Design a protein around this ligand. Structure first.
Ligand code: HEM
Lengths: 573, 588
């Protein structure tokens, strides 16, 4: 119950709707019980009064009750359904907004401690289990408790002994049982979760390995293992169902016990009258109606374990805390920016002995510098550090001779443009997928940006509007690079940090991309990371580094005068 | 769309339920016995209360009509338990059968079709969209059986006593269906659209949550969080236009129940006051009949109330049935089965003429082909990326259908028996896979038994000979799920050992040198050349080094072979191979 408190405290925004739903449910149950009780008592009293009682029996008064009970029950049922289904949606929206807002900040130094895939689906399933929590758990327990209390006091107004016996029976049924049905449930749930995980792992392994398990004759001895695991899983499910039937059996038996106890007790002087008359039907009908109203409580205990697991999972994921902070003190930006590194010795908090030992370089304003090297030497680490994803372990970084620490989120994210290695296409229109960079461009600006070097085939299509991604059109890397560069160009920043811009391409497309990148930005400072030295002769400062350190730096002509650094005397791959 | 799809989905769900007919019939019979037991309990309680409220009888003189009530309660509890268990078994059997059918179809589809989804869609489909069927069947179908059975029994039971109380219950029964269906309903397939929109909203949220990295760079977030709020508002406003109508059925049913109870109570109450005369049957209206009518009235509509509770169970199953029916009705192609076999001791010579390769769904993948492979030779199929290079390999492996003639030592390939053809092959994959537990098993997968010297002299200084005193166990160390602990190359030296363990007659390679370090690449290609020196080999690779030893080099452009020849004759002629080598040289 401890895990539910931080999420039971999220309902303080909308309390009126939940209170209205609870009140309407209570009112409906009370109206039904009162209607049945009144009908029974009227029948018995009229029968016992006889013919010579018509002048001493004012039947006009008990008609307003049997009218109001029906009207109230109908209206309460309808509006309770409506109000509950409104409150559920409002709570769902608030939960989604809160989860996304608390998960946004810890993107780079966060979610990397697990496997990124199959985590988000678990998060979504947990949110669904939480809204199910709200409704299915909160409503019936409070409704039943209030109804029981009201019925008990109303009956106690007549005679205490029977009323308090009925109240004790209902209280013991409501309170004792669900805790007593929460141990074998826990055991079976743990076993079932383990078996389901094993089955999913085996199924994924078989489906992925079907390529080799057929050429090497093996794919007959693994379907058997899959079937055996499925059999064990079904056995666990059957063991759970055999337990869940006992709840209904015991509930019916308890109702029978209460009715029999009422019938035997009310037969010998209820209220202090050895020959009571016309009051025996009262208690019996009240007990029958009340005990045919506790059905929602029976199934409430099944939803608790999954909800608790989901809540604790979400709470643990959320409290992972961020990595870096932002001194939100306001500042301004300038059209001329420069990058100045002096010394950085950075390692990941996870493991150690990575690159970036003593890297040092100076970049002037409006200078194009390309970083060369092999794969894994530490270029990508430099790119990820420069956007302040992680934090420098020890060193200084200055932009315009100003420390990178004293910068707002908006200023830092606006003054630096990044062309990432992987391009993500949102499941939306081309206009929506492209207006991320600049949410002020008209249709003509988008049209001319596209009509520049890059994509011109998508210009006609069915128009700017389309479906991009899983739902609609699919693009390739050659069609992705020229859109990522378009996004970067639209997000006008004085410093552009291009990641690998030509990997996984062909000759003509690479040449066109190089011409585009050389022409469309001839004033913006550019520091791109490449490992294919095609066209690397128009840069005034080439830096080649390996094993996490700089081996030599110089201009192409000057640095080519000391034997092939990577050319290997113009011979190699 | 609308009703035309909902009706066929419901029809398919009903049709796929002929595997638990005995269990369903047993459940229906058990429901019938619950009726007789409810009518017994009511008669006995009325009998006790008319003796106790009128014609005062001592309490200790009604023991005989008292034990039978307890017996009836016990019997009803037993019947409820039995019904629950039978329903669960009936639900489980259908899931078993459906999962078996789906797995069989997926196995028969072939590896070409499987590698289209990111290995999560299939598992999600199977588990999530198969459990809902059991939920729906077990919880719903017995209730439909009960809802028509119990009320007629109650009506028949009440009629002999009074013909007015029975007519009160009869009157309502026509009305609720007609009123409900005609005015107050008519939008039942519209709720399917709302459910689909609700699911797609979660899908869009998931898509946004995957893109959290690309939103951090551009400064979005606070400006993006409004989109979720706007979408949720739109969804809520759209949804609450139909819930003002779909909730009228509950109001109608509650109103009819209350009206019936009130009418019965009023009639029987005013009967004894000497103000009414309808159905005393020339004897006289007694309280024992009024109490029976009052007690049995709630039990009339209770089966129908439970049907409202089980709506979310049926609406959830239709969503799964939609995807299951879509999957099971897709038209495929499949390869053609074979019958002939051949001898195990002979070289294999492959020839073809005007051969086309087709994807399992459609479209031509490899255009026209024309080649001839002498026995014992080594052939390399180089070319531009995305030209369908890895299509001849799948055509030879028997994973794809084809048009034309593909001859393996004379005989075609549509006539060979797979269980006698796949014994002549040995495969090396681009992306390694380890579908076992122990590292020894992933090596002996070809033959799950051997001596103790092949694990010594398997391949070379590979992960079998060397790379042993680096793992905290021996050769029986459990690899794990998808070789998570073995990250360097995803173990592209155990797959080569597995291929090299078994002597073969046609070795197929599919870019084996990808994602390895320089020493690992050197050792891998050394072992590969040593293996290919012994038998016919067909290699598809992108590396352009040490190709002087290969007999013939094929260049594949747009699925068509353009130039064939040795390295010396083809590195100077100036064809597409010249352009490829020039580009690779310009890389450094
Ligand atoms: C937004 C899509 C939804 C629609 C269209 C919908 C519609 C309905 C309908 C038609 C009923 C039955 C009314 C009757 O019996 O005549 C119902 C009942 C109910 N719904 Fe929903 N519902 C939706 C989502 C939800 C959600 C998110 C919850 C919360 C978990 C929920 C919980 C319930 C409950 C508790 C009941 C009554 C008892 C039950 O059937 O479980 N529903 N809803």
């Amino acid at each position: 119950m401890r895990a539910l408190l931080p999420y039971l405290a999220l309902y303080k925004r909308h309390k009126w709707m939940l209170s209205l739903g609870i009140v309407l449910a209570i009112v409906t149950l009370l109206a039904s019980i009162g209607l049945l009780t009144l009908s029974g008592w009227f029948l018995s009293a009229s029968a016992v009064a006889g013919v010579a009682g018509l002048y001493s029996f004012n039947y006009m008064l008990p008609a307003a009750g049997v009218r109001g009970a029906a009207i109230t029950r109908t209206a309460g049922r309808y509006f309770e359904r409506l109000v509950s289904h409104d409150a559920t949606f409002r709570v769902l929206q608030h939960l989604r907004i809160y989860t996304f807002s608390k998960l946004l900040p810890l993107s780079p130094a966060g979610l990397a401690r697990y496997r990124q895939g199959e985590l988000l689906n678990r998060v979504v399933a947990d949110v669904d289990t939480l809204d199910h929590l709200y409704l299915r758990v909160i409503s019936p327990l409070v409704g039943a408790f209030v109804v029981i209390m009201v019925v008990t006091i109303g009956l106690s107004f007549l005679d205490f002994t029977l009323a308090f016996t009925l109240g004790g029976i209902m209280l013991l049924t409501l309170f004792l049982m669900p805790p007593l049905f929460y141990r074998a449930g826990k055991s079976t749930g743990q076993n079932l979760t383990h078996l389901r995980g094993q089955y999913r792992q085996q199924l994924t392994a078989w489906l992925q390995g079907q390529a080799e398990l057929t050429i090497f004759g093996a794919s007959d001895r693994y379907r058997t293992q899959l079937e055996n695991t499925e059999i064990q899983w079904l056995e666990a499910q059957r063991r759970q169902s055999e337990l869940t039937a006992l709840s209904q059996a015991i509930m019916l038996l308890i109702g029978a016990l209460a009715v029999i106890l009422m019938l035997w007790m009310a037969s010998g002087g209820v209220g202090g009258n050895a020959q009571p008359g016309a009051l025996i039907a009262l208690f019996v009908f009240c007990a029958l109606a009340a005990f045919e109203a506790l059905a929602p409580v029976t199934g409430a205990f099944q939803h608790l374990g999954q909800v608790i697991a989901s809540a604790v999972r979400i709470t643990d994921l959320t409290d992972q805390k961020p990595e870096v902070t932002f001194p939100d003190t306001q500042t301004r930006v300038a059209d001329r920016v420069s990058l100045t590194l002096r010394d950085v010795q950075f390692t990941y908090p996870e493991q150690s002995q990575q690159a970036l030992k003593g890297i040092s370089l100076q970049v002037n304003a409006g200078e194009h510098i390309a970083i060369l090297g092999r794969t894994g030497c530490g270029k990508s680490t430099l790119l990820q550090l420069l956007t302040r994803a992680w934090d420098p372990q020890q060193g200084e970084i200055l932009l315009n001779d100003s420390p990178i620490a004293s910068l707002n989120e908006a200023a830092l994210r606006q003054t630096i443009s990044v062309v990432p290695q992987r391009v993500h296409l949102f499941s939306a229109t081309l206009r929506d997928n492209l207006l991320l960079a600049s949410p002020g461009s008209s249709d003509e600006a988008l049209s001319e940006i596209l009509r520049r070097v890059g994509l011109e085939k998508l210009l006609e299509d069915a128009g700017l509007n389309s479906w991009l991604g899983e739902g609609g059109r699919q693009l390739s890397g050659g069609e992705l690079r020229r859109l990522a560069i378009a996004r970067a160009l639209l997000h006008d920043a004085p410093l552009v940090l291009l990641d690998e811009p030509t990997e996984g391409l062909d000759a003509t497309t690479e040449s066109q991309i190089l011409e585009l990148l050389a022409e469309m930005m001839r004033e913006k400072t550019v520091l791109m990371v490449t490992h294919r030295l095609r066209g690397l002769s128009r840069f005034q400062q080439i830096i080649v580094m390996d094993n996490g350190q700089i081996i030599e730096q110089g201009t192409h002509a000057e640095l080519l005068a000391r034997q092939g650094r990577y050319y290997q005397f113009k011979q190699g791959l | 769309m609308n009703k035309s799809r909902q009706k066929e989905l419901t029809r398919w769900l009903k049709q796929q339920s002929v595997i638990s007919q005995r269990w369903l019939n047993i459940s229906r019979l058990l429901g019938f016995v619950s009726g007789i037991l409810i009518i017994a309990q009511a008669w006995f309680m009325a009998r006790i209360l008319q003796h106790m409220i009128m014609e005062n009888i001592p309490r200790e003189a009604l023991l005989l009509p008292f034990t039978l009530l307890v017996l009836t309660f016990v019997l009803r509890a037993w019947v409820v338990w039995l019904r629950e268990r039978v329903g669960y078994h009936a639900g489980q059997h259908i899931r078993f059968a459906i999962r078996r059918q789906v797995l069989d179809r997926l196995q028969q589809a072939g590896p070409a079709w499987i590698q289209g989804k990111p290995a999560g869609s299939w598992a999600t489909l199977v588990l999530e969209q198969i459990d809902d069927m059991h939920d729906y069947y077990a919880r719903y179908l017995p209730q439909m059986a009960l809802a028509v059975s119990v009320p007629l029994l109650i009506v028949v039971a009440i009629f002999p006593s009074n013909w007015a109380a029975a007519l009160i219950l009869l009157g309502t029964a026509p009305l609720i269906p007609l009123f409900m269906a005609l005015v107050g309903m008519g939008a039942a397939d519209a709720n399917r659209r709302n459910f689909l929109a609700l699911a797609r909203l979660s899908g869009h949220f998931l898509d946004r949550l995957r893109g959290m990295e690309t939103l951090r760079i551009f400064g979005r977030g606070e400006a993006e969080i409004e989109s979720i709020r706007s979408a949720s508002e739109d969804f809520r406003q759209r949804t609450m236009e139909v819930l003002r109508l779909a909730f009228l059925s509950s109001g109608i049913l509650e109103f009819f129940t209350s009206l019936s109870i009130a009418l019965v109570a009023v009639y029987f109450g005013f009967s004894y006051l000497g103000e009414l005369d309808f159905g005393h049957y020339d004897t006289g209206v007694t309280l024992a009949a009024g109490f029976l009518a009052l007690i049995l009235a709630p039990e009339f509509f209770q089966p129908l109330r439970d049907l409202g509770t089980f709506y979310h169970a049926k609406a959830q199953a239709v969503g799964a049935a939609d995807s299951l029916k879509t999957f099971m009705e897709t038209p495929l192609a499949h390869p053609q089965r074979g019958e002939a076999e051949l001898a195990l001791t002979d070289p294999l010579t492959i020839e073809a003429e005007d051969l086309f390769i087709t994807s399992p769904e459609g479209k031509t993948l490899a255009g026209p082909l024309n080649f001839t492979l002498p026995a014992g030779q080594r052939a390399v199929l180089v070319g531009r990326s995305g030209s369908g290079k890895s299509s001849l390999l799948n055509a030879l492996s028997g994973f794809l259908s084809y048009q034309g003639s593909l001859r393996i030592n004379g005989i075609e390939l549509r006539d060979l028996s797979p269980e006698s053809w796949r014994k002549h092959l040995s495969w090396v994959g681009q992306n390694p896979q380890l579908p076992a537990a122990t590292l020894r098993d992933n090596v002996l997968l070809a033959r799950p038994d051997a001596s103790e010297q092949e694990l010594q002299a398997a391949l070379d200084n590979a992960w079998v000979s060397e790379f042993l005193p680096l793992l905290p166990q021996g050769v029986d160390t459990p690899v794990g799920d998808q070789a998570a602990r073995l990250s360097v190359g995803q173990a592209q030296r155990v797959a080569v050992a597995r291929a090299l363990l078994n002597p073969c007659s046609l070795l197929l390679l599919d870019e084996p040198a990808a994602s390895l370090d320089a020493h690992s690449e050197q050792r891998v290609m050394e072992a590969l050349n040593a293996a290919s020196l012994r038998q016919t080999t067909l290699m598809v690779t992108h590396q352009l080094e040490d190709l002087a030893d290969w007999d013939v080099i094929w260049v594949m452009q747009d699925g068509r072979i353009i130039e064939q020849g040795r390295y010396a004759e083809l590195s100077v002629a100036g064809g597409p191979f010249a352009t490829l080598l020039a580009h690779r040289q310009e890389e450094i």
